[PDB]
Structure 1
Amino acid sequence: MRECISIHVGQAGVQIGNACWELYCLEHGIQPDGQMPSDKTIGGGDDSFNTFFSETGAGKHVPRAVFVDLEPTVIDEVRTGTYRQLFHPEQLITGKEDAANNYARGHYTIGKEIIDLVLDRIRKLADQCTGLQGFLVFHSFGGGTGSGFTSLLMERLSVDYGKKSKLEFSIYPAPQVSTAVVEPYNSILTTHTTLEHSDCAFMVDNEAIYDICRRNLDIERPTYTNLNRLISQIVSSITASLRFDGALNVDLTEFQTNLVPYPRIHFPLATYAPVISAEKAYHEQLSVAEITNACFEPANQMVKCDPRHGKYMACCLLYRGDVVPKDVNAAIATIKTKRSIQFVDWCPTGFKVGINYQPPTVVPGGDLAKVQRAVCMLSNTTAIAEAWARLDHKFDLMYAKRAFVHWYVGEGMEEGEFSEAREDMAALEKDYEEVGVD
């Protein structure tokens, strides 16, 4: 058994982390107080869930998680909420005023004064590990803390944990659910100082989650609670192999191996099906073929793009529920003949399949309906570069006029770091085009 420490940074990270650990507890039969009746080894054990939960002599199952925010109003919720007993106070860290949606303020001004405190709390969780694998980092691209402090933390993690892997779950900015005009600046600044530090990054476009909630859940004006409960479902599908007995994606290194054959192209696309409204009178349960085929519909992708016009480097199918291998291959055979699935020549045309028999757990009273089988597909398409393209465009529009730059310079950042970060985005889009187009 090897431990995995989760780090939630900024408002988006903290609230998504809240929705994941709420789900992890329902999945592993863990109560809000930390008790687990099923665990028969009290105060210890090297089981599958022990990669994410430590144990105390009193039988408490404590998440191997750390929460970091530069302003306290968001983490104070965790300190008084349903699961206020899961985490001990050291795990929750808060400042007094935020980065004001200013990357430079989170990276330099405020981040400098609190980086050693965070690393000290992380070093505590690391000391409770017999064989630490690495870290899963949750944050937003647009937030000042989510962007600024995350990239600073990522830099130090590579220095203090050189032989550990780092996974990112990054929230891509959507104007529909955001009031930040400068998010393109923060997004591209954080991708520059974090590109050579992340081993595998899962982007989640809030616009994608927003439309799934409206289209499939009949939520007219979705809230963060709706978005986050759905995002925690996908995240749960992705981290399940680390927390449950199995052979696919057993450790964090296997995410890089199976999803990232080329180092600088480490942004896999996530697709999820089915999303059924709990308020439905009653849905006709979909089959293996139907949910598998849904993974090739853009309306179910975490990032809106057209995989028909890119090339696949890796494809990984993760099933939960009543799924048998025979039905998976049968659906795959039918999709090859119908869909447009082009793999790069230097990669094999194939699919790694993982089945977990326990069907997806749904938060009681939530929005998602119980289903007999669900699938999350992880595929590395060059088509996801469309998301970077959109962002780059917005960045260029404002930086040509230097709009809002003074805010960043005023916090100690030099202007050139902008263009140096933008040129790194031009390099990234050059790789995606060498790998995809002919």
Structure 2
Amino acid sequence: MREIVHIQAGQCGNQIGAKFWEVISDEHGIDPTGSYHGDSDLQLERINVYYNEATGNKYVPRAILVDLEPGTMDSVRSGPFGQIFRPDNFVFGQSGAGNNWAKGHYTEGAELVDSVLDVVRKESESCDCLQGFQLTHSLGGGTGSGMGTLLISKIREEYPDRIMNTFSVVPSPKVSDTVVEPYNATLSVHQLVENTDETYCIDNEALYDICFRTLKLTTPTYGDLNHLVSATMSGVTTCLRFPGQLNADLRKLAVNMVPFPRLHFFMPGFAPLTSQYRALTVPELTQQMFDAKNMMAACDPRHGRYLTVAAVFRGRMSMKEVDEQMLNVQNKNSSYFVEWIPNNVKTAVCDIPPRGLKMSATFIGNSTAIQELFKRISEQFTAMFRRKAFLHWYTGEGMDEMEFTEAESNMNDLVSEYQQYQDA
């Protein structure tokens, strides 16, 4: 099991996805046209996880670009690393999704979904041993939310035994396109609970506050929000992309991180937070990555308990001092880690650091506090839904009010389920 197939859905999906590929191509020494111009053999030793090798020794990403309008995917092609993606893997409709789940899932997206899966199959067929799939998308809009969750269901039908990861940008009024986002998010969450093994909850509320408060950016763009995401995305995928001895796959992570199948909603963190000259000591990275300020999902981890943690330190450092520091926060704050899962924090180290920093730390937490994020969207949903506000946009595409009442209830059970183990 080596190969991962990547899909990126809609505006946000394709935007953060582009940056993920820009970031990791740089770490692997792969230039904008697809040729390798690095130095180490360690850059190429697990390049087959995210790249196909082409004629004339070009490296092309195993990446499929999906949208219901040509806007964003045109910008990706014009953008800095656009010439590397296989042009056949640009699959786009024309009419758009209008920030409407129904359009993405049931009508406009239904028309395009088969043509997307053909390319998925095309990239899968030439995988020595396909391990799984990862999707970048948002739950607030139409395409990424609706069509993204449809593709997830189609991919599961056709490849029911592979791993399905998502990097899912959860919405927020602080960084809002449209009032209907909580509807879209809530319909998507119900899908993700069934059809994904891991879902990385990127919350736009959190990314804003990190950009605003802890980076001193007064007026942050989506660009500033996506820097944080593409750094985090490089961080969690480090151990797949590099050697070694203590090397990794998706399924073992999914197994060890997810004690109950519906509870697979992780809370990312990164340290230090960038947009520097003093390198951080190991005790600082450990303090920072566990800080609520560094979390990408706007939840206070003190309001719940960790079921499992996974931590990935990058850089040349004392593995003695990492162990010692990781054992310090566990032994000094043991009330916030469940007692009934022994040794539930796993640490890995990787010698290659990311562009800019001499040593970093990425944090993956399956905390019960993540219920707060779903409670927030569940409140935003009901304020509107209790007056059937804005439903005409969805019922016009064939949707029923029953489907909304279901998706509401499924997510309120998810919050109950997370609350259950926060007390036990």
Structure 1 residues 262-341: aligned runs within 5 Å: 262-277=260-275, 282=277, 284-339=278-333, 341=335
Please give the residue correspondences for 1:59-78 in structure 2 after superposition, counting only pairs within 5 Å.
59-78=57-76
Q: Distance in 2 between matches of 1:98 and 1:167?
A: 25
| Contact 1:165/1:252 (<8 A) preserved | yes
User: Are residue 437 (structure 1) and residue 420 (structure 2) matched?
Assistant: no
Amino acid corresponding to residue 163 of structure 1 in structure 2: D
Q: Is the 8 A contact 2:19 2:227 kept in 1?
A: yes
The residue number in structure 2 matching 1:409 is 395
Q: Which runs of 4+ in 1 moved over 4 A?
A: 38-41
Secondary structure of the structure 1 residue equivalent to 2:70: coil
Measured against aligned partners, the alpha-carbon deviations of 1:151-185 in whole angstroms (never above 9, x if no partner) come to 11111001111111100000010222222101000
**AA aligned opposite 1:123:** R
- Once the two structures are TM-superposed, the CA of residue 48 in structure 1 deviates from its matched residue by 0.5
1:84 to 82, 85, 88: 82
Any residues of structure 2 matched to 1:134-153 within 5 Å, and which?
134-153=132-151
2:11 is aligned with 1:11? yes
The answer to which of 342-351 and 14-23 deviates more is: 342-351
Corresponding residue for residue 22 of structure 1? 22
Any conservation in 1 of the 2:31–2:37 contact (CA below 8 Å)? no
Counterpart of 2:131 in structure 1 is 133
Please report how far the alpha carbon of residue 38 of structure 1 lies from its aligned counterpart in structure 2 after TM superposition. 4.8
TM-score between both structures, scaled by the size of structure 2: 0.96
Taking the aligned partners of 1:277 and 1:120, their CA distance within structure 2 comes to 38
| Aligned pairs (5 A) from 1:161-180 | 161-180=159-178
Q: 1:378 aligns with which of 355, 359, 364?
A: 364
Report the equivalent of 2:346: 352
Q: Distance in 1 between matches of 2:338 and 2:235?
A: 26
Structure 1 gap segments, 5+ residues each: 362-369
Q: 1:255 to 1:349 in 2, by over 3 A?
A: closer
> Residue 7 of structure 1 contacts residue 65 of structure 1 at CA under 8 Å; is this kept in 2?
yes
Residue 264 to residue 150, structure 1, CA distance change in 2 (3 Å): same
| CA distance, structure 2, for counterparts of residue 341 and residue 141 of structure 1 | 33
Question: Is contact 1:308-1:340 (8 Å) kept?
Answer: no
DSSP 3-state at the match of 1:133: strand
In structure 2, distance between residues paired with 1:255 and 1:47 = 21
Shift of 1:214: 2.1
Aligned position for 1:35? 35
Partner of residue 235 from structure 2, selected from 234, 237, 257: 237
Q: Deviations over 1:122-174 (max 9, x none)?
A: 11111111111110011001011111101111110011111111000000102
C-alpha distance 69-116 of structure 1, shift in aligned 2 (>3 A): same
1:366 aligns with: none
DSSP 3-state at the match of 2:36: coil
Listed one character per residue, the Cα deviations across residues 227-273 of structure 1 (whole Å, up to 9, x for unaligned) are 11221000000111111112557211122112112111001111111
Deviation of the 1:195 alpha carbon = 1.6
Deviations 1:359-393 (A, max 9, x none): 112xxxxxxxx222111111111011111011101
The equivalent residue for 1:394 is 380
Match of 1:367 in 2: none
Counterpart of 1:331 in 2: which secondary structure?
Answer: helix
Cα shift at 1:79: 1.6
- TM value normalised by structure 1: 0.93
> Kindly, what percent of the aligned residue pairs are identical?
42
- Equivalent pairs counted in the alignment come to 423
Are the equivalent residues in 2 in contact too, given 1:273–1:376 (CA < 8 A)? Answer: yes
CA contact (8 A) 1:216 1:276 kept: no
**Cα distance in 2 for residues equivalent to 1:360 and 1:62:** 21
Report the more deviating stretch, 332-341 or 119-128.
332-341
